[PDB]
């Protein structure tokens, strides 16, 4: 009774693909983001934005295709199809990099949709919404890297382009220009990711190797029942093993699983904060004390100063092709090079 | 019981606070030697001629490093793969100049960590467990072998092994990209899927179990007190967990079998990281990442750059700058 | 004065002290180099 | 080496303030009636 409740009923019906109110946002945006990417990487060039071939059509492979960022001259234009740049011309829109903002913006709203879905489904089934909470980390990463970062820079041009090799280029740029590996926020990110992968592996292995014998089969998967009340593995034996091997062990399963949420989620959040700084060139580039010493003392050398020489190489060698809007011409004689190479 | 019998009983005892075991008889002294040498070297070691060009690199705290820039620096390129223990040096001063600590540390470490892996098998057997936790640990272990031993072997020098330090690690990585285009190598790509996936599934599993904890506590206390160590019953509702995740994606993308789920949690990061380790270990013999440099050409023959060509420019920058005084001839062949 | 019924005891178990101290010390070990610059 | 002359007190307080907070909390938990 009442169109809203009737719509709510239908939206929330238990079907193969749950829809929900969240689905109204999620499905179109996620579909357009994914479809935008497939369309661009298959058919669309980056000749006019980057001087790059970027599609299967031009001869790129899965590793080299991308949907590239718009030209630097576009600034942070939303680049809407009907906007003042493309003026409703679909072909020109593609050539100007309009699919990049298309995918970034639809992708952002799609992510909002997915997290709302996590909330919606949790509420309906009656579980706590920790999965949604955990998803805040992918969201912080996407927003900081694909939105905040280029927004602090000159234009969308310097956002990551959506492609395998293009993303690799983004990594190397961050090394050469930002010294991003030196950043403690990135370091915490690394710790959360590697620590998360570690926890994933060690927990999976531990459960699988402290299983109770609940069947006669040598393949042990059958001997589990979804409705069984009993733990399928021995927490007590697991605890003794790790206490004796490593010195400490989990004793509390709830803490264990919360910690598995905490580690990679916190790591990703920390890396996002660092990238927000990088939006402004607020880098962890240098140690001042190192530079003062090195400048005065030509025999003082550390791995820190060695890496800056690599960075200087990266900037000078990659900049003219990577930043074509700058029209860099670096005569051969000014290029930094060690002996012979 | 004779003395040897009692000793064997103590060594293999399931009642020692930390398990010893036969793998432990090797692990304990080797890890202690590696640790002690590492700590002393990181604080106090003088500069090391890593590239064999009489250009010593300072790794230690007292010689001007902080935590981030400090390292135990790899042994000299003049040494190559030659075994350089303390007793092959004329003096500790020579041993230090040439990067002797690095060899001592990595060799004791690798042996000790290999025994750590055996020890995990060993205790599992003593406790009546299934045996394969050690197989999971073989993934990070393989990765350590790759950067400390296999890469040096293929390239002909421990000077090319990963330095024992934070900035030294980044150095290793950047040079590796220049020389192997590792980013474009499918085994490193599998590595990334392994660790990104591992972290994703870690968060997912953690969140799903946390989401479905059975109410056993009030609001003014931590939910963790709702589980008691060693209790027989499960602490969360796996049916609720599955009912949520199945609807999030679709019913059949969700695990209902906890054994299958936990196997997947083990296998995904472990397999991915085995591939990572094999990436480094095969790039050690210079079978490198995909090379699409100038792969796209127009009707006339003009090179049409792709993102691969931009990567190549960044790689060139690393290549021409690294070890700026070490190369006399035009090609970097190791 | 009539007592406040909203008061609650606060707790930190030993494991949480150890986890917390680890966090703080490792963060210090990480950030100290940047503080000294 | 020409380090930041506030690095020492920054690091000391960074360690001590939250460590002390935790120690206060731990010890007063132990002293509570069992």
């Amino acid at each position: 009774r009442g169109w809203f409740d009737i719509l709510d009923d239908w939206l929330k019906r238990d079907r193969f693909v749950f829809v929900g109110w969240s689905g109204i946002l999620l499905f179109p945006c996620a579909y357009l983001a994914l479809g935008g990417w497939l369309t661009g990487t298959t058919f669309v060039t980056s000749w006019y934005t980057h001087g790059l071939a970027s599609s299967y059509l031009e001869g790129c492979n899965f590793l080299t295709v991308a949907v590239s960022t718009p030209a630097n001259s576009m600034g942070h234009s939303l680049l809407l199809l009907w906007g003042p740049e493309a003026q409703g011309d679909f072909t020109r829109w593609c050539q100007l990099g309009g699919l990049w903002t298309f995918i970034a913006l639809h992708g952002a709203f799609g992510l909002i949709g997915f997290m709302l879905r996590q909330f919606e489904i949790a509420r309906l089934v009656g579980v706590r919404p920790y999965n949604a909470i955990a998803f805040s980390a992918p969201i912080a990463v996407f927003v900081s890297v694909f939105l905040i970062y280029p927004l602090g820079q000159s234009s969308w041009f310097f956002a990551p382009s959506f492609g395998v090799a293009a993303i690799f280029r983004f990594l190397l740029f961050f090394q050469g220009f930002h010294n991003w590996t030196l950043n403690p926020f990135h370091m915490m990110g690394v710790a959360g990711v590697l620590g998360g992968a570690l926890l994933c592996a060690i927990h999976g292995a531990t459960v699988e190797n402290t299983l109770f014998q609940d069947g006669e089969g040598a393949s042990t998967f059958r001997a589990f029942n979804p409705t069984q009340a009993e733990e399928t593995y021995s927490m007590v034996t697991a605890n003794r093993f790790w206490s004796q091997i490593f010195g400490i062990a989990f004793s509390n399963k709830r803490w264990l699983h919360f910690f598995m949420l905490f580690v990679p989620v916190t790591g990703l959040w920390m890396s996002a904060i660092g990238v927000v700084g990088l939006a402004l060139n607020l880098r962890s580039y240098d140690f001042i004390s190192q530079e003062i010493r090195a400048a005065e003392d030509p025999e003082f050398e550390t791995f820190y100063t060695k890496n800056l020489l690599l960075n200087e190489g990266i900037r000078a060698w990659m900049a003219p092709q990577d930043q074509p809007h700058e029209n860099f011409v670096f005569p051969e004689e000014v290029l930094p090079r060690g002996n012979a190479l | 019981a004779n003395l040897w019998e009692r000793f064997c009983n103590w060594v293999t005892s399931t009642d020692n606070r930390l398990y010893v075991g036969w793998f432990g008889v090797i692990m304990i002294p080797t890890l202690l030697a590696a640790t002690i040498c590492f700590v002393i070297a990181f604080i106090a070691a003088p500069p090391v001629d890593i590239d064999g060009i009489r250009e010593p690199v300072s790794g230690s705290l007292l010689y001007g490093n902080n935590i981030i820039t400090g390292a135990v620096v790899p042994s000299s390129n003049a040494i190559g793969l030659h075994f350089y223990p303390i007793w092959e040096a004329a003096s500790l001063d020579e041993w230090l100049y040439n990067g002797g600590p690095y060899q001592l540390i990595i060799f004791h470490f690798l042996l000790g960590a290999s025994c750590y892996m055996g020890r995990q098998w060993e205790l599992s057997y003593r406790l009546g467990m299934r045996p394969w936790i050690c197989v999971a640990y073989s993934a990070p272990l393989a990765s350590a072998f790759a950067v400390f031993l296999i890469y040096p072997i293929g390239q002909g020098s421990f000077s090319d092994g990963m330095p024992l330090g934070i900035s030294g690690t980044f150095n290793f990585m950047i040079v590796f990209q220049a020389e192997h285009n590792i980013l474009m190598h499918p085994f490193h790509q599998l590595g990334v899927a392994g660790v990104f996936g591992g972290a994703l599934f870690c968060a997912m599993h953690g969140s799903l179990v946390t989401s479905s904890l059975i109410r056993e506590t009030t609001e003014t206390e931590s939910a963790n007190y709702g589980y008691k160590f060693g209790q027989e019953e499960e602490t969360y509702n796996i049916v609720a967990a599955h009912g949520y995740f199945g609807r999030l994606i679709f019913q059949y993308a969700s695990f209902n079998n906890s054994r299958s789920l936990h196997f997947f949690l083990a296998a995904w990061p472990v397999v991915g990281v085995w591939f990572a380790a094999l990436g480094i270990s095969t790039m050690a013999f210079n079978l490198n990442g995909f090379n699409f440099n100038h792969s796209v050409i127009d009707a006339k023959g003009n090179v049409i750059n792709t993102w691969a060509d931009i990567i190549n420019r960044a790689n060139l920058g690393m290549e021409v700058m690294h070890e700026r005084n070490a190369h006399n001839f035009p090609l970097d062949l190791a | 004065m009539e007592p406040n019924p909203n008061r609650q005891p606060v707790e930190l178990n030993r494991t949480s002290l150890y986890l917390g101290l680890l966090l703080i010390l490792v963060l210090a070990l990480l950030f100290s180099s940047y503080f000294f610059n | 080496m020409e380090v930041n002359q506030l690095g020492l007190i920054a690091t000391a307080l960074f360690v001590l303030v939250p460590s002390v907070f935790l120690i206060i909390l731990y010890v007063q938990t132990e002293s509570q009636q069992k």
Binding site: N239 | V39, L61, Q231 | N13, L25, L29, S32 | -
Partner: peptide, 30 residues
């Protein structure tokens, strides 16, 4: 002082490992 500071923090971390292992709250089966 920097070096003292780094070594101090490291030393405290090692001390923490000792207490966390040998003076942990023992796990107890209820």
């Amino acid at each position: 002082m920097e070096t003292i500071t780094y070594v101090f923090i490291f030393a405290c971390i090692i001390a923490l490992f000792f207490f966390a292992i040998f003076f942990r709250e023992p796990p107890r089966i209820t």
